[PDB]
Structures are given as structure tokens and as C-alpha cells.
Amino acid sequence: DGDQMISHRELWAKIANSINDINEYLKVYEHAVSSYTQMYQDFSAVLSSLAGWISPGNSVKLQVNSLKKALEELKEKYKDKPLYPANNTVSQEQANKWLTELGGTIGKVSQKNGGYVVSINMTPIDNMLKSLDNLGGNGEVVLDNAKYQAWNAGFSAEDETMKNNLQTLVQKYSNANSIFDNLVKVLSSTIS
Amino acid sequence: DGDQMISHRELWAKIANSINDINEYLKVYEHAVSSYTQMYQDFSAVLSSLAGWISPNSVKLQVNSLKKALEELKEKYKDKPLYPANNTVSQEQANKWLTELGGTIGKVSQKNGYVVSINMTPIDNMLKSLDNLGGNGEVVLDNAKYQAWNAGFSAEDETMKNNLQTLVQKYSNANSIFDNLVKVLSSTIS
């Protein structure tokens, strides 16, 4: 039973196969971080442009159509850029396994071509688009210093929501790298 | 070289030997985390007692009360080190583990025999920052002086907090390497 023999040559093949299996596991994390960094980058640009989209109206006059147009273009930009698998698609239970691995809030499962993918969770974008529409009025809307301060607080709260979501995603990727590094060091130091 | 054959029993043995070797890594990490955690818990207790040492518009500070508390914490952990938990090791044994854990978390001391004691440079900086304050116990400081001192005091606190956090992460990462290696050994059998 345990008398079956294998060569050193066959072991290195089994090691190299498992090495490639973990590398593609890391490249999923690598792409997931890269696409969420870009999404947060473009979002932070919308928040930096906010200063040029507000003006005095004691109160302030907010250009809603300019801000809503930028968020719509941002949501449309990452409609076809998912966190995983960046190409083709996988099954539904497979996408749910990666959603739970990456975090439920940072990702969102959706199907594209029969199968399913893990698209970027655009809930803070949707929440920012609905909060604007509830400031009833075509074009620009005037709000007192108190209401704008509360609306701007929720805007910065969603911005910090993405900032910490990205930081934990980077930490998981950094941890997986160190776990892979020492794992390869261990497997090589054994047959050395 | 590559034509050499090994049996399935030698496979299970070769994996188990590396698993017992990495378990010795976890034995060091587990204790070192436990020793630095108890120190930061005792230090966190001193922070909870800081509210009773400041009082009112300037502030008053029982400098000698906080000084003796910090100095007692260091003397408590002067003999309780990070590694080894018992006895001692060689010089290059403590230096290799100092580099593994980080040159900032620990300090290599000599016992007849070397040991990696807990690095107390944050406590030393706090004590000199307190000694730079006024004399004879209680000290009066305006709001500006308390803002600056508490800023550097919170910085040294956050330094130990980050030191403990990164050490736990290495221990969590080192445990998952043990877990994954166990998964391969269990799969090879059957």
C-alpha cells in the first residue's frame, strides 16, 4: 500500500504544479486589488472635484448634474471590470467562494455570459446617486449650511468606507504573499 | 540524481519532519506573542489609570506617580523575555530570531548565554519625556504643553500597538503555513 515508489523527478513535477496553482491564486488577489485601487482612485477624483462644483447660494448651491454625471460615468466604467476572474467567467458557487474570501462588502456577484463573476460592489456609488436625487430640483439645488454639512459627511463616510475596504484587501494580498513565500521556502528547504 | 526513487513512507516522514520543524517556529512565535501581549495589557492598565493622574484652564500631572508606574512595568518585564521562555540560547541564535521578529520589537540581552528580552525603548522615551517636565511630583502645564506631550505619548503607545499587531499577523501567517502543510500530509494518506 505504502510501498509504492516515486522518483525525486516526479516530486518536483508535483511541486511545480502546486506552485502554479498558488500563483494564479495570487494573481486573482493581485488583479482584485488593482481594479479596486483604480475604482477608488477615480472616486477620490470625484471628491476632489467637488470643491469646484459647489458655490454660495449663508447657504451653498450644489451642481447636482455635474456630480451625478461623474458618478454615472464611474459606475459605467466599472460595469465590465470585475474583481474576478478578469476574463471569461466561473460558476455561481465559485464566485460566492471568492466573494466570501475577498469580503462581502467589497465585491458583488453578477452574471455576464451564462456564468457568474464577482463585479466591483458599487453600493457606495449607488448610495451617492440616490442621496443626490432626494435633493429635489432640476440642475442645482440650494441647501443650508447644516444640511450640506450632513450630506457632505455621508459623502466622506462612503469615501472612507472604500478607503478601509481597500486597505484590508491589500492586507490580505500581502498576507497571502508571505504565506506563499515561506511555503515555497519550506518545500525547497526539505529536498535540499 | 533525479532518477533516485523514494517510497511513500519516506514521503510521509519527510513531510512530518518539516512539520515538526515549523512547529518549533510556532512554539517561539506563540510565546513571544503572549509575552508582548501581557506587557501591553499591563501598559494599557497604566493608560486606564492616567485619567486619575491629570486634573484641571491648565492641567496638573502627577509626574512621579506616572514615572514610578512606568518604571515598575519595565522592572517587571526585565526578567520576562520574548525568547527563549526558559534557560538561554547562543548569541547568533538570539540574533537570527531578533531579525525574524524585527529589530524594533525585541532586544538581545546577555545571561551568563543570550536572550531576546522585550524592547522597552518606548517606555524609556516616555520616561525621558516625563523627566523633561517640571520637578517635584505634581506639575502644572498649560493646554499647549499637555497637547504636545500627550501627542508623543500616544505615539509611543501606538508604536507598541503596531508592534503587537504585526507580530500577531506573523504568528497567524505562520499558523496558516502549518495548516496548509498539514492539509498536504493528510491528503497524501488515502
From Swiss-Prot, chain A:
Key words, A-Z: Coiled coil, Plasmid, Secreted, Virulence
Subcellular location: Secreted
Effect of A13D: In plasmid pINV_F6_M1382
GO biological process, one term: effector-mediated activation of host programmed cell death by symbiont
Keyword Manganese tagged: no
Family of this protein: Belongs to the invasin protein D family.
Role: Required for bacterial invasion of host cells. Controls IpaB and IpaC secretion, and the efficiency with which they are physically inserted into target cell membranes. These proteins are exported via T3SS to form a pore in the host membrane that allows the translocation of the other effectors into the host cytoplasm. Along with IpaB, is essential for both blocking secretion through the Mxi/Spa translocon in the absence of a secretion-inducing signal, and for controlling the level of secretion in the presence of this signal.
Additional detail: Deletion of amino acids 1-20 abolishes invasion activity, affects contact-mediated hemolysis activity and IpaD secretion. Deletion of amino acids 41-80 and 81-120 restores invasion activity to a higher level than wild-type and reduces contact-mediated hemolysis activity. Deletion beyond amino acid 120 reduces invasion activity and abolishes contact-mediated hemolysis activity.
Protein name per its UniProtKB record: Invasin IpaD
Organism for this UniProt entry: Shigella flexneri
First and last residues shown, out of full length: 124 to 320 of 332
